Design a protein around this ligand. Sequence first.
Ligand SMILES: Nc1ncnc2c1ncn2[C@@H]1O[C@H](COP(=O)(O)OP(=O)(O)NP(=O)(O)O)[C@@H](O)[C@H]1O
Ligand SMILES: [Mg+2]
Lengths: 198, 561, 171, 258, 613
Amino acid sequence: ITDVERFKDTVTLELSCPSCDKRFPFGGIVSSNYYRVSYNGLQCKHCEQLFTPLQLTSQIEHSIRAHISLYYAGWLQCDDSTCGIVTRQVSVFGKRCLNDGCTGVMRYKYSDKQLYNQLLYFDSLFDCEKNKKQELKPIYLPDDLDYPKEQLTESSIKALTEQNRELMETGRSVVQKYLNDCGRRYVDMTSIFDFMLN
Amino acid sequence: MSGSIDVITHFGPDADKPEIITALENLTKLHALSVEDLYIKWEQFSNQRRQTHTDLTSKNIDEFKQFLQLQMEKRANQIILDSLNPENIEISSGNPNVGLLSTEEPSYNQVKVEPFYDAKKYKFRTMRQNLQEASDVLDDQIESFTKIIQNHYKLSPNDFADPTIQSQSEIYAVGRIVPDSPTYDKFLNPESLSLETSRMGGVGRRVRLDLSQVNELSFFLGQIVAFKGKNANGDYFTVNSILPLPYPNSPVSTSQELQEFQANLEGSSLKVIVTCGPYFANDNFSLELLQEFIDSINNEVKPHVLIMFGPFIDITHPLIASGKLPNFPQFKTQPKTLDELFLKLFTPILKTISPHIQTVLIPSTKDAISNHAAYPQASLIRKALQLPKRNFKCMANPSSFQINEIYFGCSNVDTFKDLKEVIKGGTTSSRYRLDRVSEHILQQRRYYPIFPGSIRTRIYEHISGADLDVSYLGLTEFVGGFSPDIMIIPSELQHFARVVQNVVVINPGRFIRATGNRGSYAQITVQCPDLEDGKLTLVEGEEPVYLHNVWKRARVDLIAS
Amino acid sequence: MGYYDIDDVLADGTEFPCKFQYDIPGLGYLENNPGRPITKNTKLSLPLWLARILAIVGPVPFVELLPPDMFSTKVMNAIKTDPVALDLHSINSHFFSLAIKWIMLFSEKELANVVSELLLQRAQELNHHASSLSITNIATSTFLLKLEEMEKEIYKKSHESYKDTKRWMFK
Amino acid sequence: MFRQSSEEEKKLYARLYESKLSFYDLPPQGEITLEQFEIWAIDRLKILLEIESCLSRNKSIKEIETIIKPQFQKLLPFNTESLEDRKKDYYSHFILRLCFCRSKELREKFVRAETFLFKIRFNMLTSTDQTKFVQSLDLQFISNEEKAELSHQLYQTVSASLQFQLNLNEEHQRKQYFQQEKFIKLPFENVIELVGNRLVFLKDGYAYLPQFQQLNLLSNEFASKLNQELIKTYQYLPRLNEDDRLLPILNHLSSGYT
Amino acid sequence: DAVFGDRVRRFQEFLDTFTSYRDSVRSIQVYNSNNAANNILPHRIIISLDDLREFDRSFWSGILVEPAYFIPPAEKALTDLADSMDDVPHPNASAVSSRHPWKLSFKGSFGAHALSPRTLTAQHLNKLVSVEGIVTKTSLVRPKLIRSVHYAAKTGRFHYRDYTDATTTLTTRIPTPAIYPTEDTEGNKLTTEYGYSTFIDHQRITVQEMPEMAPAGQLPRSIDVILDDDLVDKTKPGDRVNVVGVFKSLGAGGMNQSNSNTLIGFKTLILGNTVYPLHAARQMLTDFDIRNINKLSKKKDIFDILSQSLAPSIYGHDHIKKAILLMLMGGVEKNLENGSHLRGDINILMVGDPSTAKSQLLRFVLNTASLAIATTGRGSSGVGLTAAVTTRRLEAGAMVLADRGVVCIDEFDKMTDVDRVAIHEVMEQQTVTIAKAGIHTTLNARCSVIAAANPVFGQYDVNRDPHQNIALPDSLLSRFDLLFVVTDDINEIRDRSISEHVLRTHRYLPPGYLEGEPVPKLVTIPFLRKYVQYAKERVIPQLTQEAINVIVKNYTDLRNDDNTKKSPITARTLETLIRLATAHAKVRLSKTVNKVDAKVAANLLRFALLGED
Ligand SMILES: Nc1ncnc2c1ncn2[C@@H]1O[C@H](COP(=O)(O)OP(=O)(O)NP(=O)(O)O)[C@@H](O)[C@H]1O
Ligand SMILES: [Mg+2]
């Protein structure tokens, strides 16, 4: 599955400039009208402010924790199109709709899948290999008004990725901290081999 | 002129052909190196190929571009405000060993801090809540309370019936307080309350509550309750009487244990200090106040135990949320992550705490240094914080632990603020709210009995909340089935210290206010257990045990930070 | 490693290569010019009793130790191919003393494993030439020119032991 | 004379790959990732797909070995000390059990391909490794007197095979080898493929097999035990149905064989 | 037989484990495949014997003690690796059956098996050894048959067969008669296909112990070595060399029936596996050297720094040092399109009083030039100094041996007139030509000459003409670019300065020694040699109009103005100006000669010629 298809429903990472407060979407090492990745790191195109590694990584971590908190807000939605009730209440049956007479199935509005894909989307933005191969989810479409006029060359992207490897690895490490705690990841063979426990 | 002659004064006059000039100019502009640097690297390139005819042709320059990128990537690879019991108990003198330089092993005056929970159960993976598992926990809560109520009031199992079914006879019903409407709009009144039953008790159905016959009540969402009443018409369960939930038992100790704890302190009083984050203001990351506090801790106060509640690095801090983190000129190397920020700011300060002071750290769900972002929450990783093993202990949230004979119950979630009560009656309304909330916590036998958890929104966008992992809420219950002697739940509300049902309930308040002004911390003095002074209550049994009665022999001072 | 031991006194005076981490006034006499400073990243050859301290005292200490030629890779390969044929006397007169001092200084693990094998393999032929008593000189004399000052003492105290026993028996 | 004197998972896989090949005998333990599950299964699947493709093209063992051996270093390494490679190999086999236990056709295709891969890897071993691997599987040689009594018949049986399979064109060399060679006695039904080609000597319902042959017994035991394990794996597929996140991967893996 | 297969497998594991040898195979293959489409590199690889020790001791000792049983399977495995890697399709007829596998070579840590010709002993037979010595004889190169191909006329089938001889293989086989088959098994007449058959090169040499090691005036001892394929002609007599190979025996040793009563021994040889030279001149630059050389060249006065760093132990004579530096750099040699030649190399002469460091300064050049020959003027004859006849064969003299180098001649005044006139060709046409009984040939001699002499009266006499003080013909003095006169003029402060200088020089102690034990900035000589080598190979300054404007004016004034000048001025003086300007531009690493270089060259020639600046 391509990153475009996998991350179609993910929220784009938005960074706020520490100097001029302008917010812009961050799409890795790509051409943008709002930021430039130089040999020294990420730079805001509006005021030319260079981001320190801490300024970047803190915003990423804040976004991650915001998504986690949203997940644990625990909003549920009925899957019946006629009812469609949205509530944070959980019945003792869990999946039973709380609206009287409804047989729909309650589901998390923000699922563990959506959160996991969101975290992976954040991880992908700081993957050096994906940046070099230009396999990231695009933040601009060619028909968008904010589509950058000047495109970075493949050679320039590879050079900028190599030059910013430490920064990209630091950002990725922040994401990986939370991904390692995500329950949606691993597969336990010990429990799985219950037939040998026949 | 300039680039052409610069090339022709390093490369030969053969470079005068403009394509060659353009290619070399492109290289110097691409890689920022000067013309003479490019000439030097061209000379490096001319070596090692047996190519005496390293002529300045277009193809040779293409190979030189490839060589330059190989060299580039290889170089990269190389490279007192308020007080409880002030009139009866003097402030402890503290730990006499604090301030003594002596490396000698701390032989006699060893306050023992021991966790009273299974730490492994808190190391579950987050961000994966199964709705069926969550519902199972919620159902089990109702069933557990049904058993407690049945045993306490000596009721038969047949006395309990489904409150949703029409009955002319009075029945007993246990369930969870829930809103009458699933889409309720944040304000609950007594007329908008329903009772959710367990799967076994009422097949999980909800029934509206008619509380007209009840004069005094205090209810909140998620509360487990027991009622005696009837459903005459099938539409609403008319409550005739509320059955008060029994309080949990108090902790006890043997005579031998109490004598050992008395000998450990040599008859002196225990001194415990409790602080709660944040530890810096909303507009900066200055820890000057914390440094001053630790200096006072080490030289004047000299506590036996220091309990520090997070958040140490609040992820919702305004400067973090806006990305406006400052430069730290005091550091040779700037921090790159919030974890490194802790290691550069907090760790040097915390390491100055005297090794004779046992330091307990309890995380917050807002703490950036914790990857376990859900309540219940795993302990901080002490090694990752580079804190010494000798006197630092990282505990879970909530945490139950024992200091000598005294059982401490700690929860770093703001239950006092989050618990919104639906009240009726003059007597209930005249009582202090935080007492009623404390009683709710004790009766429910859980540090955070609210369900669904609280959320904070801004103009709506979700900001934060209690962040409850519902499948693991069993870990938030009182450990061992008894209340703590001292319950500490930090809250954004005003600091307080109170005795509620023989439990000392403490909110230390915030260490520092948002504006940078001083906040508050709690100083707890507990007199030593004495079998002869009559402050302990003997409970008769096969083995004589004693109630600690910490509330009779504890002083709590709320002090400006 | 006693205080009054002559061999230890004499082995500590061997020079090792060093590099400075601070500029310092007046210490140019180390560079054989008393009238001048030492400057950062200068390289000098200093005796071990001095370099052993200037590498430790602070933070960044004053001197950094460079890898000396007597522990070079060529020597290690020579040691590991055939230890008995090796001319350690030409490499350095006090090899097994300096080896232990350097191991203590840097807590090397692999060097200890190499040196232990070297000693154990050379002890065999040393015992062979110790046991062989006349009832020959060239065959013995060729190997006994490749012994360290450390190994000569063991050879002498072994030969005398065998000879005294032989003398007493046949008497 | 003079004289002197989880970790368990890692030790398990060190034990399982000490022989360099395994019958894949035991239940895995601990955890790996779901990405690893998919990728490892696809890697082994690619090797087995090429093996089946070459066999459908009727290519010989030598040609298949020339085609498949470069793929081990990329997809499924062999003759390696790496714990990651060993876990990759073991787990990928176990995953494709669950993919290919589902039907008789899938079981037959998987058994055929995996047994041929087993043959390839066994050919890559040294004779010492082969001996140790066979001995580890707890796998009757005839007496010297019985060999002497049957020597004419056994030599007549193997003399052509010694010339063509071991290149022993000289009769003197064949006699010396035969003097040093051991023979195995078992029922003729166990080696019937060699019987049909008249490569073994038959007496009273028993086949006499030289030690330099008989690898078909080892690979047939591997195939038979794998078939039985797949039948067992099929019987407890309803327990696999408890994690939905695995079924699309297994459907994708099986689709390339249908 | 079965053991051969396992040894091939084990070496395959080694080649897969240590990956730097795969890169070597592949790089040679892709290089050869590139230029084939338009020199070619040999199919040979050198392995570190240490890697093999750390990989498998049982294989290491096997290679080193039983090479006949371990080298062949290892070499076979290398060929399989190179063959399985991708290669160009549709090979030609000769390529299809070349009979050409890859071959091995070794380096590092031979231990006890590092030997010399005196100490090679019967215990070492069939072992792999390393020897050191001097080459004394070399055979002519000869081709050797190993395989032949035949076409059968009727059936259209191509047949072939292989041949062996005792020096072609490490293992031993029945010898082959060297006959070509004329007729098929089935009676068909055969034809031989040259060009599809395979032949290889063969050469025998002899190596002797170095004379420095000879005991007691005793006879020296020597060994014969066999070379083939790529190793042929990489040495000549007088080379100091280190050879690696297998030490082996040959023949019947008289046990095939002979008159000797078998007292005579068996024959023995070393089969050359690898050959390395010994330095006893050239250096190879690292990247850091290129950087330092280029950075230093931008100082304001590099010529002063470099010139003063020549012979710092000699006080004074700044201008002679500068002249020697320009000589070591040299001009640029021209060959015009019609075959006409214009000289490039600079010749220097210096004449002066006794003890004034003439011989001492002349001695320095001999130890900083890359190729230099030294001789005394009376110890050499005209033919010995140029060329001589022998048996017809023609044998080179000293000026022919130093071709692209420098020749130093001391006591030049003692050379007879009959000897001096042999040199007149060599210093301008740069050739030697002989026309004697049974011989006519031309030889090349392109060197620069530097020489020292004493004046006629034993000390220079200023009260007599320079021609009276310097008894040499005008046609010879014209061939020296710079002629320097130097004298010992007595003066207090000069005497004091020189004496203090030599006393400071005699108080030196070398670094590793205690006192009394027996044994501006200046660049080191090992760096100056790299600077000179780099400058002479990588920069060739072209002349410019601004330089020419200075050269023409200076030449016409210097020739026409009447003065007491000490040398004849001729058309060769103009060339001296051009050469000196070019050499100075080369010191500066400039791609072109500028006005500054011409000015400096003129100011040096004026000093040497007219005695004053
Ligand atoms: N600065 C100096 N000037 C002159 N002579 C020096 C100087 N430094 C050393 N010498 C010594 O002068 C002595 C004679 O030098 P040398 O080069 O042989 O003189 P020369 O010109 O060859 N004399 P001669 O051999 O009679 O023609 C040697 O012993 C040198 O060491
Ligand atoms: Mg002299």
